[PDB]
Write an enzyme that holds these catalytic residues in place. Structure first.
Site, PDB file in Angstrom:
ATOM      1  N   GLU A  35       1.787  31.160  68.025  1.00 54.84           N
ATOM      2  CA  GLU A  35       3.426  31.121  67.570  1.00 54.84           C
ATOM      3  C   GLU A  35       3.969  31.690  68.462  1.00 54.84           C
ATOM      4  O   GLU A  35       5.541  31.145  69.406  1.00 54.84           O
ATOM      5  CB  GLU A  35       3.723  31.771  66.591  1.00 54.84           C
ATOM      6  CG  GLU A  35       3.147  30.917  65.216  1.00 54.84           C
ATOM      7  CD  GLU A  35       4.240  29.974  64.796  1.00 54.84           C
ATOM      8  OE1 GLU A  35       5.787  29.747  65.170  1.00 54.84           O
ATOM      9  OE2 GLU A  35       4.196  29.604  63.841  1.00 54.84           O
ATOM     10  N   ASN A  46      16.212  26.309  66.327  1.00 55.55           N
ATOM     11  CA  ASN A  46      15.233  24.975  65.994  1.00 55.55           C
ATOM     12  C   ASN A  46      16.577  23.701  65.625  1.00 55.55           C
ATOM     13  O   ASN A  46      17.794  24.183  66.112  1.00 55.55           O
ATOM     14  CB  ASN A  46      15.276  25.514  64.253  1.00 55.55           C
ATOM     15  CG  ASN A  46      13.812  26.994  64.511  1.00 55.55           C
ATOM     16  OD1 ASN A  46      14.323  27.652  63.733  1.00 55.55           O
ATOM     17  ND2 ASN A  46      13.085  26.023  65.100  1.00 55.55           N
ATOM     18  N   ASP A  48      18.091  22.840  63.808  1.00 56.75           N
ATOM     19  CA  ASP A  48      19.159  23.132  62.010  1.00 56.75           C
ATOM     20  C   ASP A  48      20.083  24.423  63.261  1.00 56.75           C
ATOM     21  O   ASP A  48      21.166  23.974  62.151  1.00 56.75           O
ATOM     22  CB  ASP A  48      19.082  23.510  61.023  1.00 56.75           C
ATOM     23  CG  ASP A  48      18.078  24.935  60.960  1.00 56.75           C
ATOM     24  OD1 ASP A  48      18.036  25.215  62.088  1.00 56.75           O
ATOM     25  OD2 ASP A  48      17.725  25.165  59.727  1.00 56.75           O
ATOM     26  N   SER A  50      19.440  27.312  63.659  1.00 57.37           N
ATOM     27  CA  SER A  50      18.638  28.715  63.613  1.00 57.37           C
ATOM     28  C   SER A  50      17.607  28.657  64.554  1.00 57.37           C
ATOM     29  O   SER A  50      17.465  28.192  65.404  1.00 57.37           O
ATOM     30  CB  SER A  50      17.296  28.401  62.304  1.00 57.37           C
ATOM     31  OG  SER A  50      16.276  27.833  62.187  1.00 57.37           O
ATOM     32  N   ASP A  52      14.115  31.527  66.211  1.00 62.48           N
ATOM     33  CA  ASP A  52      12.946  31.887  65.906  1.00 62.48           C
ATOM     34  C   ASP A  52      12.394  32.846  66.811  1.00 62.48           C
ATOM     35  O   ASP A  52      12.862  32.974  67.756  1.00 62.48           O
ATOM     36  CB  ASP A  52      11.492  31.751  65.330  1.00 62.48           C
ATOM     37  CG  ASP A  52      11.848  29.625  64.477  1.00 62.48           C
ATOM     38  OD1 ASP A  52      12.767  29.897  63.576  1.00 62.48           O
ATOM     39  OD2 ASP A  52      11.270  29.065  64.797  1.00 62.48           O
ATOM     40  N   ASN A  59      12.125  32.797  61.534  1.00 63.73           N
ATOM     41  CA  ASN A  59      13.449  32.460  61.250  1.00 63.73           C
ATOM     42  C   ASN A  59      14.597  33.718  60.834  1.00 63.73           C
ATOM     43  O   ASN A  59      14.888  33.600  59.810  1.00 63.73           O
ATOM     44  CB  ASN A  59      13.367  30.967  60.742  1.00 63.73           C
ATOM     45  CG  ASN A  59      14.242  29.653  60.738  1.00 63.73           C
ATOM     46  OD1 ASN A  59      15.168  29.648  60.066  1.00 63.73           O
ATOM     47  ND2 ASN A  59      14.372  29.714  61.951  1.00 63.73           N
TER      48      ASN A  59
END
Ligand SMILES: [Cl-]
Ligand SMILES: [Cl-]
Ligand code: NA
Length: 129
Positions: A35, A46, A48, A50, A52, A59
């Site tokens: 990750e 991301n 949309d 958002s 991380d 998230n």
């Protein structure tokens, strides 16, 4: 902070992740490797809108507040910036709530695609724990 593999394993064991909800420590170390490459300062945006955050790429649409994800939840009740600290406590405590929500470690796409079904004990092999 960029952790070493065995250093991170020992920190995660100290914070109660070994066998948490049935997931052995190697699962958590493998997830962190793919990750974030063990970097607590990692961030990724991301599609949309958002973002991380941190060593486990938590998230902002559901788990933390970053002030720029409209309509999102903050189920860990923390600012997302807390997840970038060299002290991994906030990340671990939020990860425990995520893994308990019914989907297990399938919440982490890199775990599902690169750790699940592999010899994850290899990630803690050679470490003094
Ligand atoms: Cl393991
Ligand atoms: Cl499970
Ligand atoms: Na949020």
């Amino acid at each position: 902070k960029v952790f070493g593999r065995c250093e991170l394993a020992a920190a995660m064991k100290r914070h109660g992740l070994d066998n948490y909800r049935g997931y052995s420590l190697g699962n958590w170390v493998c997830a962190a490797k793919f990750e974030s490459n063990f970097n607590t300062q990692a961030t990724n945006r991301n599609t949309d809108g958002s973002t991380d955050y941190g060593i486990l790429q938590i998230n902002s649409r559901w788990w933390c507040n970053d002030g720029r994800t409209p309509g999102s939840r903050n189920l860990c009740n923390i600012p997302c910036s807390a997840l970038l600290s060299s002290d991994i406590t906030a990340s671990v405590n939020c990860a425990k709530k995520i893994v308990s929500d019914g989907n297990g470690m399938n919440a982490w796409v890199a775990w599902r695609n690169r750790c699940k079904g592999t010899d994850v004990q290899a990630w803690i092999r050679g470490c003094r724990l």
